[PDB]
Design a protein around this ligand. Structure first.
Ligand code: GTP
Ligand code: ACP
Ligand code: GDP
Ligand code: USI
Ligand code: CA
Ligand code: CA
Ligand code: CA
Ligand code: CA
Ligand code: MG
Ligand code: MG
Ligand code: MG
Lengths: 349, 425, 438, 62
């Protein structure tokens, strides 16, 4: 029967997958460095892609796409969008962004900053990085100078995306949020969108004049659970599902989640992944790859969807692990290693 | 690349005789030494074990040794008695009385020089000597005591040549005398230093195989030797017949022995015989990795494989063996050390043994061989702590520290197997 | 004109040499007896094919080759095979007992005894050269002779032929056909000692040839004969520039200039297409665009790896058959817009191209189909380092336990050479990453 | 996409297409180390033959 190895012990998603695989009675686990495996649940950094697919008589699959980092790191994502003809500088769903080193865009960033300054247009900018966990290393200011010195205060790269000053605010609460979507790409490069997303919602009322607050503006589950007093009032753990957010949109705005938001979501997902398809595809390769991505979106008050970032090692909501993890095994693993409806929306292309 | 064969003692000469009977049949040589075979593949490597004599006669490159003439006279009268070179029979009269000391120090020392003389005459007639193989038991006196003495003498004159042995390990279920653990423990210490490969043929397994699997109520030494000769034929098929494998004794040792002292192999054979139903490739691979087909009374699941070699004989799908060989890996992947990559070898010989369409020979370097040495060590200490039956040996000049030293070296050998059995990457 | 001497070391080198020289004779119209009816220059000449063949007064065309193995069974097959007449006895050198897959035995113990003889026989051919260019050395990484003695020979050629070029054709070990487990040791040991003595080395992974034979030739279980004839075609396309008229890669020096900007990083990746089975009575003949695109499918590379995740330092396209420049440029234009081909910033993004109008030649009764056009791409990409990493990892697994090390120490080598060579590989693997990744 | 240095003859043609411009040890110490490895083999063999010699002595002490 089939064999697999676990090399990322701190993975919530694949800890359930490996657990469900053993309960099948047709999968056997091995130590981290046993090379005679059918499936690798590999590490997150420096995964040895070069050692895969060289074992006679063993079809080898892995849960990561070599090169997918170019889409999952903020600095590289900006580069990909600005230099890829498929995406182009004239991209309508990605906020105006610039990569700033402490190749560089320090001066071109200020060129557009003053073109808005003179025109009285909103000049709120945000600085971000993929190296700061637990919401550390974020800044929202309206004066550009006072952020470049802070960027140089550290010795790594930061990006400067736009701050969406007019988000969609939920009522009751007058509060902010972002949307997390989970997308599975199998060995055939079929793009599967998990039907169940989640709203990661802020519990503090949005305040435009005061960006001093560390929590009025950042909605990630953690910064609201150990930095705010209102965690859990309107919904459990600042997490609202699609069925409710859909009902709210029908009642409050007379529209649906599918029409107003999800079509834009599906367009961005397939646009981003089809851009890098020829650089990471494992169709005619000696090993094959799949990977589950976590796309983070955000909706403005005109119901326009914006992409903020893509996470390549995402966690899932407590309330969908069982269903999602089962879907991975069904579509990503058993599809390659067969045994003795659907939760995914296939994004065709 | 010639091999020089030596058979010493009762057990050594009988299993040696069967061996020459079996491979002689496979190479098409009759009891008189004349070739009446159908294929030229039989002769392309006949020189490995046979000299070409006057009259297009082929003579085994074998030396026959014993301290009493009994078994050697039987051999000269047996089926293939007349094929051996008469000047290669070297015997004494007294005997060794199942005493390692007599074979190694007193009675054997008297005869050893005469044996080495025949070795030199055989080696001088070798275009390029490849090494030596010895057949003998470890429980007696001649094959055990004198056999190890010969090995020590051969490594002296031919220090850069390979020395391998087919050694029959004693077992109480098949026992001639009680001092067998003493003789075995003294012999193994010699084999740890002066042999490159020792195939551990355990009489306990040969009996259990004849009785349990083959359903033979009263097995004789002849029944056990049928298994031994079949295995030795299978082990030597890689040199005796011409595949695209360029196999030399040293090259094979380099590939199977990761550490000098750990060169004790578990032989295996399949199918087990004493029917006409064609056996399937899945069945051959599944049986040859089963404990019931092992010639050493050890459980491979109680240890781990350092290296493995499987030899298949007959016309079969070389693709199918690979698929099944790769399949069995998973079913016992935990029992293969991961710090020796690709440590399982497979060879195929188009020529089947006599009366078998397909066969398989198994050679495993497993740390589970340790179980065998513990068994012998226990039987040794059970007597030695009371100094039982030691007078037989002290009467021949041996001191008790030689027994203590041999005991400690085998316990060391056991401990060395244990460290690598627990070792991980 | 300038001669080239081929040196075939060990079983792999000798058997691959057999296939190569067999193919050369067919391509040049030379018969097994050494006669060349089309050669009107009797007893001599300075034609391009004379770079690989000398001429006798009797009209015989003799390969400028040396076969050397530490045991005679393989070269004995040469002395009795279809091409007995092609070579003369002094060109075939054999020992008595081999190196038993032990680098130390081939380099030290036995190598000392035959090195002087081999160099002597090589000098006897060199004295027949008016303007010797260098040597082409064929050998395996895994064999004790192919690894240990080859390294020793390479060192001595650099002292006796300091200013002369040396190219390698190396067989990289693959478990699917390899009957040895210590080949990682020998591979690392020989690469370390030979690296500074080789100007350009084309390494062929038996794994790649094995799958190519199974996938594209539908040979259920390939043999060495199947593998070698395919390898010979790649070797022939690579050396055709030296044997036929042309402007590209006509001197061994040009290989280093065109393909190797840094000396240590001199392992170009070879990709070949099309491989078509002879059993298929007729195959839709592939166009210039199709075979050129095939040059970027890793399933056609001599080494399994992903160039998309490395960078190119040079690239040459060697076509044979019905090819014209315009069709090549058309294919390249589309390919650039569909493939991930990023060069290092300090090298130009261009292809050096050469075309021979004579189409590929295949052995009669072989497994390869006759095609109208074919191409071999030579690219120096950092992605090939994946092979070093694979090899280095297996080395580390066994050496941590000192498994089999006693076999080498017993032949006079020191443990320090293991770590000394491994560290050299560690630097090489790091050099590839510096050039290849940001 | 520029084509350059186009040479051609009866056997074929050659050219270069550009899509973008850019942005030893001596003999003695070889033959010495061979000898150093040989002497290490001879020392190992002498130790073996000495070890065996010790055993021959004990054999006839018995
Ligand atoms: N591609 C290819 N590889 C070969 C061939 N013959 C041998 N090899 C490789 O060579 C290695 C084995 O060592 P050998 O080449 O046989 O060594 P040798 O030159 O015969 O001398 P030894 O060291 O004694 O074995 C294995 O890894 C084989 O894969 C061949 O014909 N083609
Ligand atoms: N264009 C934008 N305008 C306003 N706020 C934004 C924004 N882009 C991101 N944010 C804020 O950042 C939060 C999410 O940040 P992000 O997810 O990039 O952090 P992170 O990178 O540490 C986790 P991950 O690595 O999984 O993406 C959101 O809650 C949102 O409030
Ligand atoms: N398989 C097998 N084993 C034997 C045979 N004869 C003796 N033995 C083994 O050898 C031991 C007796 O030693 P022995 O043969 O007398 O040694 P010798 O004095 O040198 O001939 C016993 O424990 C048996 O297990 C035989 O014919 N076949
Ligand atoms: C006791 O005297 C002898 C006489 C003849 C043979 C042997 C022998 C046989 C053997 N089996 C076949 C084999 C095993 C591993 C291999 N690797 C590459 C080819 C290859 C072939 N293995 C060993 N070690 N010895 C020992
Ligand atoms: Ca006497
Ligand atoms: Ca004498
Ligand atoms: Ca001419
Ligand atoms: Ca040089
Ligand atoms: Mg991140
Ligand atoms: Mg007896
Ligand atoms: Mg060889």
């Amino acid at each position: 029967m089939y064999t697999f190895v676990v090399r990322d012990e701190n993975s919530s998603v694949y800890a359930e997958v490996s657990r469900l695989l053993l309960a099948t009675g047709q999968w056997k686990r091995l130590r981290k460095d046993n090379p005679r495996f059918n499936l690798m649940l590999g590490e997150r950094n420096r995964l040895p892609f070069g050692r895969l697919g060289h074992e006679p008589g063993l079809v080898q699959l892995v849960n990561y796409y070599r090169g997918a980092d170019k889409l999952c790191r903020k600095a590289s994502l900006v580069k990909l969008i600005k230099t890829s003809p498929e995406l182009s500088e004239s991209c309508t769903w990605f906020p105006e962004s610039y990569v700033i080193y402490p190749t560089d865009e320090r001066e071109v960033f200020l060129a557009a900053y003053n073109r808005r300054r003179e025109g009285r247009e909103g000049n709120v900018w945000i600085a971000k990085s993929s190296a700061g966990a637990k919401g550390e290393g974020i800044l929202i200011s309206s004066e550009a100078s006072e952020l470049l010195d802070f960027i140089d205060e550290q010795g790594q790269v930061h990006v400067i995306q736009k701050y969406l000053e007019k988000p969609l605010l939920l009522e009751p609460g007058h509060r902010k949020f972002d949307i997390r979507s989970w997308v599975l790409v199998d060995h055939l490069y079929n793009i599967y969108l998990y039907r169940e997303g989640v709203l990661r919602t802020s519990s503090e009322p949005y305040n435009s004049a005061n960006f001093q607050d560390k929590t009025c503006h950042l909605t990630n589950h953690c910064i609201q659970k150990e930095y705010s007093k209102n965690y859990g009032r309107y919904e459990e753990g600042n997490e609202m599902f699609f069925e409710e957010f859909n009902q709210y949109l029908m009642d409050a705005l007379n529209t649906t989640l599918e029409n107003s938001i999800l079509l834009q979501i599906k367009h961005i997902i397939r646009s981003c992944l089809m851009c890098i398809e020829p650089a990471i595809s494992t169709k005619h390769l000696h090993y094959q790859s799949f990977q589950l991505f976590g796309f983070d979106f955000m909706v403005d008050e005109e119901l326009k969807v914006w992409l903020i970032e893509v996470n390549g090692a995402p966690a899932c909501a407590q309330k969908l692990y069982a269903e999602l993890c089962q879907g991975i095994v069904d579509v990503a693993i058993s599809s390659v290693f067969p045994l003795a409806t659907s939760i995914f929306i296939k994004l065709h292309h | 690349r010639e091999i020089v064969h030596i058979q010493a003692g009762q057990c050594g000469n009988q299993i040696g005789a069967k061996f020459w009977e079996v491979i002689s049949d496979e190479h098409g040589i009759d009891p008189t030494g004349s070739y009446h075979g159908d294929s030229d593949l039989q002769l392309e490597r006949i020189n490995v074990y046979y000299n070409e004599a006057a009259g297009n006669k082929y003579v085994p490159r074998a030396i026959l040794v014993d301290l009493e003439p009994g078994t050697m006279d039987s051999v000269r009268s047996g089926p293939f008695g007349q094929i051996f070179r008469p000047d290669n029979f070297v015997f004494g009269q007294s005997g060794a009385g199942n005493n390692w000391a007599k074979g190694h120090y007193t009675e054997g020392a008297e005869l050893v020089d005469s044996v080495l003389d025949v070795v030199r005459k055989e080696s001088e007639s070798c275009d390029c000597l490849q090494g030596f193989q010895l057949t003998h038991s470890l429980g007696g006196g001649t094959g055990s005591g004198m056999g190890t003495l010969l090995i020590s003498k051969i490594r002296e004159e031919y220090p850069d040549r390979i020395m391998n042995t087919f050694s029959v390990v004693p077992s109480p279920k098949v026992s001639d005398t009680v001092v067998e653990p003493y003789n075995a423990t003294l012999s193994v210490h010699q084999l740890v230093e002066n042999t490159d490969e020792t195939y551990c043929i355990d009489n306990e397994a040969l009996y259990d195989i004849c009785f349990r699997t083959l359903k033979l109520t009263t097995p004789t030494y002849g029944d056990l030797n049928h298994l031994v000769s079949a295995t030795m034929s299978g082990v030597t098929t890689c040199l005796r017949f011409p595949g695209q494998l360029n196999a030399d004794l040293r090259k094979l040792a380099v590939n199977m022995v990761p550490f000098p002292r750990l060169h004790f192999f578990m032989p295996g054979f399949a199918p087990l015989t004493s029917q006409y139903r064609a056996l399937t490739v899945p069945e051959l691979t599944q049986q040859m990795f089963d404990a019931k087909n092992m010639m050493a009374a050890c459980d491979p699941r109680h240890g781990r494989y350092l290296t493995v070699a499987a030899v298949f004989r007959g016309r079969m799908s070389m693709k199918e063996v690979d698929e099944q060989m790769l399949n069995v890996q998973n079913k016992n992947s935990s029992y293969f050390v991961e710090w020796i990559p690709n440590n399982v070898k497979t060879a195929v010989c188009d020529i089947p043994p006599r009366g078998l369409k397909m066969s398989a020979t198994f050679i495993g370097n497993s740390t589970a061989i340790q179980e065998l040495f513990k068994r012998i060590s226990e039987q040794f200490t059970a007597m030695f702590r009371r100094k039982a039956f030691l007078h037989w040996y002290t009467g021949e000049g041996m001191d008790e520290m030689e027994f203590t030293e041999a005991e400690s070296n085998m316990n060391d050998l056991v401990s060395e197997y244990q460290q690598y059995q627990d070792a991980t990457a | 004109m300038r001669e080239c001497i081929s040196i075939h070391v060990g079983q792999a080198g000798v058997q691959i040499g057999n296939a190569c020289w067999e193919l050369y004779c067919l391509e040049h119209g030379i018969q097994p007896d050494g006669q060349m009816p089309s050669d009107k220059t009797i007893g001599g000449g300075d034609d391009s094919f004379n770079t690989f063949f000398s001429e006798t007064g009797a009209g015989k065309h003799v390969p400028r080759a040396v076969f050397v193995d530490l045991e005679p069974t393989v070269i004995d097959e040469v002395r009795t095979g279809t091409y007995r007449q092609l070579f003369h006895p002094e060109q075939l050198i054999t020992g008595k007992e081999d190196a038993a897959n032990n680098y130390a035995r081939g380099h030290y113990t036995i190598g000392k005894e035959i090195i002087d003889l081999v160099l002597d026989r090589i000098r006897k051919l060199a004295d027949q050269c008016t303007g010797l260019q260098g040597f082409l050395v064929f050998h395996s990484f895994g064999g004790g002779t192919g690894s240990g003695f080859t390294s020793l020979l390479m060192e001595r050629l650099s002292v006796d032929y300091g200013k002369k070029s040396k190219l390698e054709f190396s067989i990289y070990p693959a478990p699917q056909v390899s009957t040895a487990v210590v080949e990682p040791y020998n591979s690392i040991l020989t690469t370390h000692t030979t690296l500074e003595h080789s100007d350009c080395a084309f390494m062929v992974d038996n794994e790649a040839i094995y799958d190519i034979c199974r996938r594209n030739l539908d040979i259920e279980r390939p043999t060495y004969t199947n593998l070698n004839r395919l390898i010979s075609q790649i070797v022939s396309s690579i050396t055709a520039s030296l044997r036929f008229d042309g402007a590209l890669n006509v001197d061994l020096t040009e290989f280093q200039t065109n393909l190797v900007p840094y000396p240590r990083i001199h392992f170009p990746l070879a990709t070949y297409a099309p491989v078509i089975s002879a059993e298929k009575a007729y195959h839709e003949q592939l166009s210039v665009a199709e075979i050129t695109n095939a040059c970027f499918e890793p399933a056609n590379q001599m080494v399994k790896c992903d160039p998309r995740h490395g960078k190119y330092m040079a690239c040459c396209l060697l076509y044979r058959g019905d090819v014209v420049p315009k069709d090549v440029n058309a294919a390249i234009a589309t390919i650039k817009t569909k493939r991930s081909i990023q060069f290092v910033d300090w090298c130009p993004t261009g292809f050096k191209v050469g075309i021979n109008y004579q189409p590929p030649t295949v052995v009669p009764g072989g497994d390869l189909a006759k095609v109208q056009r074919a191409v071999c791409m030579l690219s120096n990409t950092t992605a090939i380092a994946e092979a070093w990493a694979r090899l280095d990892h297996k080395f580390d697994l066994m050496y941590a336990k000192r498994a089999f090390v006693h076999w080498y120490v017993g032949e006079g080598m020191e443990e320090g050479e293991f770590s000394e060579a491994r560290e050299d590989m560690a630097a090489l693997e790091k050099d590839y990453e510096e050039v290849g990744v940001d | 996409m520029e084509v350059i240095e186009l040479n051609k003859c009866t056997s074929g043609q050659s050219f270069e297409v550009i899509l973008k411009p850019p942005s030893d040890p001596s003999l003695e110490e070889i033959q010495k180390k061979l000898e150093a490895a040989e002497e290490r083999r001879k020392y190992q063999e002498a130790e073996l033959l000495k070890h065996l010699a010790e055993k021959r002595e004990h054999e006839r002490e018995v």
